[PDB]
Design a protein around this ligand. Structure first.
Ligand SMILES: Cc1cc2nc3c(=O)[nH]c(=O)nc-3n(C[C@H](O)[C@H](O)[C@H](O)COP(=O)(O)O)c2cc1C
Ligand SMILES: Cc1cc2nc3c(=O)[nH]c(=O)nc-3n(C[C@H](O)[C@H](O)[C@H](O)COP(=O)(O)O)c2cc1C
Ligand SMILES: NC(=O)c1cccnc1
Ligand SMILES: NC(=O)c1cccnc1
Lengths: 182, 182
């Protein structure tokens, strides 16, 4: 498989950063609630806590983030891969009927959270910049929830099976073997 | 351990996105060549290939990226953890004497590449935005090199031991067990 619009066949340059974590991005609310898959997510500030996500203009998610100015980063486990794949292949709110997700209210944003997620990070858009073929939406974190066990020791519990993306349809989780640097 | 300037003790919010990949950021050149550790790295565009990295103003790396307008993202393996830890704990160019790294010329930028890295992604700064306590440096990718075996099948070779960060001094790599979504 290759990314769409790869005119010169070869490995996509971005693959040099892989494997990357895979998250879900929830946008909209009510009948407009949507979810997509997103790898291109990072933290951009500690205090205040701010995150960013690169979203192509053609995503339905892009329209919904522009319209409402809010999004939720929901953290999936490997056990919900089938739902992550639907989120990353089907288009728009009608896909939710196909997904094993239970929408629950957020603490602060109007966009819902996903009950099955390991964490839900509630974001308000503070910037949108166009870089190449994506918009980088920067979100101030205004709330969050998480599954106690997934972060039981004030750090990620590797038993929770955090999801990473290797290539097109190939995913993995982490080893449970921790290496200490100090 | 907690991040510096965590006034209210508890798990840092950003930890909800962890584990995250750990990269190295090379900046400067000559006697000013520097390397630091960076987790807060993502892709922001496919075509053209553009990346971003969140760097605190207090990093020596910040000064060097501002001065020269270029940086290299070098991808470490778990086998070079000791060097990654020096990059992420010591300050400025004098740390290189302590690291098992061989600097080699980049293809395009003046900042050197690291021979031992799995990949070296050469970047020219196209934007710098302040979000909270970090600058988000956005870099257009103008060249790259990589170890053939690490990406042998036009995708990451999990045998290469790509590095991820769990908590302060704790690191892991990926399982080699691939899950197919399609
Ligand atoms: C694992 C995976 C990761 C993805 N990461 C991104 C991403 O970071 N940004 C993006 O714009 N699209 C990404 N996509 C593509 C969207 O998830 C996909 O186009 C989705 O169908 C869009 O749905 P929507 O139109 O309902 O927003 C990803 C897809 C997959 C399968
Ligand atoms: C694994 C790890 C990841 C890190 N990620 C970041 C990061 O994304 N951004 C940042 O500004 N500092 C990050 N740091 C902190 C810098 O690497 C660290 O402060 C380093 O000593 C700065 O070196 P310098 O002053 O030579 O630039 C990280 C540190 C470690 C150990
Ligand atoms: N173009 C994209 O945004 C993208 C990112 C990761 C996987 N597939 C597509
Ligand atoms: N403040 C930071 O930039 C940072 C990121 C990851 C680990 N330690 C510090």
């Amino acid at each position: 498989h290759h990314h769409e619009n790869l005119y010169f066949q070869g490995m996509e340059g971005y693959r040099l950063l892989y494997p990357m974590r895979t998250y879900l991005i929830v946008s909209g609310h009510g009948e407009e609630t949507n979810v997509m898959a997103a790898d291109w997510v990072t933290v951009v500030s500690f205090d205040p806590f701010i995150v960013g996500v690169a979203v192509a203009p053609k995503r339905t998610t892009h329209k919904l983030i522009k319209k409402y100015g809010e999004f939720v980063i929901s953290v999936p486990s490997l056990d919900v891969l089938r739902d992550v794949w639907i989120a990353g292949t089907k288009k728009g709110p009608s896909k939710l009927k196909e997904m094993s997700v239970t929408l629950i209210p957020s603490k602060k944003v109007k966009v819902p959270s996903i009950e099955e997620a390991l964490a839900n990070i509630e974001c308000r858009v503070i910037d949108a910049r166009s870089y190449g073929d994506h918009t980088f939406f920067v979100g101030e974190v205004v709330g969050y929830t998480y599954k106690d066990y997934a972060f039981e020791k004030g750090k990620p519990n590797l038993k929770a099976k955090f999801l990473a993306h290797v290539s097109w349809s190939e995913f993995v989780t982490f080893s449970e073997k921790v290496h200490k640097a100090e």
